[PDB]
Write a protein that binds this DNA or RNA. Structure first.
Ligand SMILES: O=C1c2c(c3n(c(=O)c2O)[C@]2(CC[C@@H]4C[C@@H]42)N(CCN2C(=O)C=CC2=O)C3=O)CCN1Cc1ccc(F)c(Cl)c1
Ligand SMILES: O=C1c2c(c3n(c(=O)c2O)[C@]2(CC[C@@H]4C[C@@H]42)N(CCN2C(=O)C=CC2=O)C3=O)CCN1Cc1ccc(F)c(Cl)c1
Ligand SMILES: [Mg+2]
Ligand SMILES: [Mg+2]
Ligand SMILES: [Mg+2]
Ligand SMILES: [Mg+2]
Ligand SMILES: [Mg+2]
Ligand SMILES: [Mg+2]
Ligand SMILES: [Zn+2]
Ligand SMILES: [Zn+2]
Lengths: 184, 368, 368, 184
DNA sequence: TGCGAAATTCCATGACA
DNA sequence: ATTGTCATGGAATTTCGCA
DNA sequence: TGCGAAATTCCATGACA
DNA sequence: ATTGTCATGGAATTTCGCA
């Protein structure tokens, strides 16, 4: 069997609804299976059109051989199936209620959900502008299992923005009380 | 100099006046019978006025001014006097064209890694498509990988908006651009400092300096043109198609596409190269590091027969940028402060301003 | 061609397929183990679609299209098939630039006598001066003698008015001009027939054909520019001064002024040449006839390394005059009807129109 | 003594008042002394300003060393004297009431006055447009004394408009009656 | 029959938008 | 159914002035 | 150890207004 | 305080297939 490579499988999923930021409410999350590289696109809905609008931007940089998602409406629609067929992208689905991806990916999506949550607390309406810094953080985050960050695995060079400061990602007692105050 | 001419009429030798000629007086003026004919020898005190009168007829150069003078007069080393006048005619210096070509172009080293240097520029105005008129072209120097963004104007605001989407992928060391309003703004400088990005600027009115992106502008337009043959010019929806098309196109000299130089592996695009299928990503990334270093690098071409290269202290003139109708194409002489490289120079004009200019926008002031 | 590929799999030799290679079947497709790697050999019936698919990605030329194809396939003489496709892509033919330079320029013989040929052209719009915006420049071919007329527009009416003042001196055999509205009008043709003047026209969008006057346009502007330094651009009153100044200016290569070539004697202007004072007007006119014949005539320069010269029946393409934004810079292929000279040609476009064009506005259609 | 040359002496004079043609009433006549070449400029008055306006056109082609005229007001004015001084042109005057020029010139000015008169009869208001044809006629008119026409003497070539048809110049009995009809 | 310097000739360069 | 041109000022080369 | 042809490399040309 | 670039298709040259 041939070794794992970038663009072999993109794992897509939606995060949200989030508090509205610049009219946006969701984040489409694209994670390359091999490198663990993350692309985040804000959408106004978890719809096929918003998925197609977002992925059309990504698929102008690189086309994956396979897209992997859960059985969400936006990904199971015949419109999304036609879009992928046109691009020669094979669609792949996890069994309903049983979301399987990969260790690296499951772990990455966890860091994403947590990093977003950490920065949402305090500025829940300013996350639109933060998506570029969140993405750089995620992609310059050292992989204990692979020895390299997703930036290194994808480009084969060190990044000009190394995120050497391995932050908490866990909410402070102050952030906890402030987060439980927002939920009112 | 009637004293100088007196000894001459008598018969005793003066340095410059050939002895073998007969210097006589007629109509109250010193004359000389020369092969060409009898010419008046004016006193040294009169020659400047003569040279100036001849020159001012049609503000003629050396030979055309000499040929007029020579019709009536003769004096030792006439051209030395013609040249002194030409070198002092402000009108001639700022209106005449150069006849010395620039030194041969530099072929700056290719940036070593992707994201080391970006080249940015705007294409447009283009036929309005979806309210958009311009395209922001971002070219990675090492790879040639291009990112296209439709804008409504070549503004700082639109550049910042676009670059914030790009910089979500990776942040570059340097961003090289021309001196367009959009890039020289304080708001843009602030946006770059804020990110550790160093702004580099081309010498003014010299798009060859942004050669990397400029050249990619040609491809973007050539491909849009082709795809729009016999259809209305609706380019907005083609930008992604063009970006992907070009980033995956072979450079015949490199035998690599900008995508391959950036990632070391083709994505799921047509005719994707399969050559490293059995290699691990590490074996593949190792081979990529080797490919990136062994790429062809052009050498400086031979200098033209009549080229000029800048020297510190040399009197040089900057080209007027947008010369008005019937106005000089050149600025007043300047002094070369520093020779940054053989094609870039620092000049001090008459105002007292320091300018970093290209030798392409300069001419060496004639007659020293 | 699955029949052609069948004999191959068996093991018996087919013209084009090297015998030293192992042609096998895998995944229901003929493959070949080549040094580069294992490539699919598609049937001849599939190759056109493949070449076209590869080419259409970025409408790439020969090598860039080949490099894509070669990633997946192999078949005998692939480039022959790539070139057949390139030569049939209308979009590539009308959008791509030439890479063959024109043949070396012709140096037409200087007209023998004054008034044999005039070269006329308009300079402008210029800053309005006394309600005037343009200048009608009339250059005698033999002498270079110039007549300047201020006009309010480059009209037939203003040309006729001006030329009626000029033609009071002498009537020319031919008047050469470009294809400007003012000269191609029926009213102007009528004005010339009425006088026995033959109208000659330059090939369209080729001002080098009117080289004689064009070049004089440069001098007129250079001198007006100089005389107007630090003053408002009031050129109307300078036209006579400029005309006289230039007509009496030495051409360093000829060692004569246009005035001297026209009259054989300087008038009462500064530094008037006195050399023929003792000659009779007849002795003077005799020497002038001798000067006019012995003038320097330039020769055609060496052809560039990659020049092209027209051949009758050759598929050639005319340059689009004012190409719209994002539109092709070339017209569809045309056939060369007659080669008038190595730089001028007669072409028949697809419409069925006869056009006399310059090779500078043509490119030879690539891939035959 | 040095032989006669073109531009050595221009003989100027005014013809008119003539019937108005395109607002013009006079013709300034310039004859080169040596070649006999003629330049005709229509003016609206026999004034210094009209003389200066006309001669400024001629002196943009060639400058004479000497201008010769009668003691007419337009030529004796200090303005005309200043104009000539500026151009290095020496002014020369014939004795009042005794107009002396040269044989060739006196003869030429006669042909001019007669050729104009001949063509005035019938179209006395259309002479403005005829000045170019009158000039070509005059300048391609063979000189019995010199063997060459003024065009040949000035340019040293044959003209493309040879006026081989040596016309009457003398008025026909029909033109005489038509001319004496206008004088009413 | 040859030197050093001045004069002349050569000619690439650029602009006629 | 016509077509490049030529001022310009350094450099190259020829000529001049003297011996 | 050398042929003819195909493949590859060279590189002037032109355009980024 | 900077700097030309590179697709293109004929021509030139090298390599291939065979002996
Ligand atoms: O790419 C450009 C180009 C150009 C211009 N500008 C660019 O930004 C720019 O990118 C700006 C715009 C503002 C900024 C100061 C720069 N201006 C000033 C304003 N202005 C005018 O004076 C005329 C049009 C115009 O915009 C240019 O003229 C023209 C040459 N081209 C094409 C080109 C020609 C030859 C080459 F060799 C190369 Cl490589 C490329
Ligand atoms: O002399 C001209 C010139 C030019 C033009 N026209 C002239 O009459 C004319 O004399 C006309 C005007 C109408 C007629 C069809 C001709 N057009 C078409 C309309 N139009 C535009 O397309 C852009 C301006 C413009 O007027 C020219 O473009 C541009 C080149 N130049 C300068 C030049 C450049 C390079 C050279 F090598 C030489 Cl030698 C000279
Ligand atoms: Mg899920
Ligand atoms: Mg720009
Ligand atoms: Mg640009
Ligand atoms: Mg014109
Ligand atoms: Mg013109
Ligand atoms: Mg009188
Ligand atoms: Zn001057
Ligand atoms: Zn094509």
């Amino acid at each position: 069997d041939r070794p794992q490579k970038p663009f072999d499988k993109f794992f897509i999923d939606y995060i949200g609804p989030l508090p509205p930021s610049q009219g946006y409410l969701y984040v489409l999350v694209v994670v390359d299976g091999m490198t663990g590289f993350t692309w985040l696109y804000p959408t106004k809905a978890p719809s096929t059109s918003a998925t197609v609008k977002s992925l059309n931007v990504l698929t102008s940089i690189a086309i994956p051989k396979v897209i992997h998602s859960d059985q969400g409406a936006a990904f199971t629609s015949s419109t999304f199936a036609e879009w992928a067929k046109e691009r020669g992208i094979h669609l792949e689905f996890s069994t309903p209620y049983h979301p399987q991806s990969s260790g690296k990916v499951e772990r990455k999506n966890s860091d994403i959900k947590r990093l977003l949550t950490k920065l949402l607390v305090g500025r829940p309406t300013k996350w639109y502008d933060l998506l570029p810094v969140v993405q750089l953080a995620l992609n310059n985050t050292y992989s204990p299992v692979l020895k390299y960050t997703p930036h290194q695995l994808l480009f084969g060079i060190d990044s000009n923005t190394p995120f050497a400061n391995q932050d908490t990602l866990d909410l402070t007692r102050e952030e906890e009380l402030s987060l439980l105050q927002e939920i009112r | 100099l009637d004293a100088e001419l007196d000894q001459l009429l008598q018969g005793h030798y003066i340095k410059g006046y050939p002895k073998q000629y007969t210097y006589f007086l007629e109509d109250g003026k010193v004359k000389v019978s020369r092969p060409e004919g009898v010419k008046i020898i004016p006193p040294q005190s009169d020659r400047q006025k003569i040279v100036l009168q001849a020159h001012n007829l049609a503000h003629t150069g050396r030979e055309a001014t000499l040929l007029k003078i020579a019709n009536l007069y003769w004096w030792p080393n006439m051209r030395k006097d013609v040249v002194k006048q030409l070198g002092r005619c402000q009108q001639c210096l700022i209106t005449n064209a150069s006849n010395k070509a620039s030194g041969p172009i530099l072929r700056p080293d290719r940036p070593q890694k992707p994201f080391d240097k970006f080249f940015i520029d705007y294409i447009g105005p283009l036929p309005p498509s979806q309210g958009y008129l311009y395209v922001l072209v971002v070219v990675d120097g090492m790879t040639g990988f291009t990112w296209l963004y439709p804008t409504k104007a070549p503004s700082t605001s639109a550049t910042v908006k676009s670059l914030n989407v790009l910089t979500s992928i990776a942040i570059p060391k340097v961003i090289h651009s021309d001196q367009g309003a959009a890039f020289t703004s304080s708001t843009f400088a602030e946006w770059a400092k804020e990110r550790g990005i160093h702004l580099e600027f081309s010498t003014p009115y010299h798009p060859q300096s942004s050669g990397k992106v400029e050249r990619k502008n040609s491809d973007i337009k050539r491909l849009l043109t082709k795809l729009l043959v016999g259809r209305p010019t609706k380019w907005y929806d083609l930008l992604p198609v063009v970006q992907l098309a070009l980033n995956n196109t072979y450079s015949p000299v490199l035998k690599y596409t900008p995508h391959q130089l950036l990632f070391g592996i083709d994505s799921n695009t047509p005719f994707a190269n399969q050559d490293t299928l059995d290699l691990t990503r590490e074996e593949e990334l190792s081979l990529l590091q080797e490919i990136r270093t062994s790429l062809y690098h052009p050498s400086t071409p031979p200098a033209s027969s009549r080229s000029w290269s800048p020297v510190v202290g040399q009197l040089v003139q900057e080209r007027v940028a947008r010369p008005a109708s019937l106005r000089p194409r050149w600025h007043k002489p300047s002094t070369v402060l520093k020779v940054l490289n053989p094609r870039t120079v620092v000049i001090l004009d008459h105002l007292g301003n320091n300018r970093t200019v290209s030798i392409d926008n300069l001419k060496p002031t004639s007659h020293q």
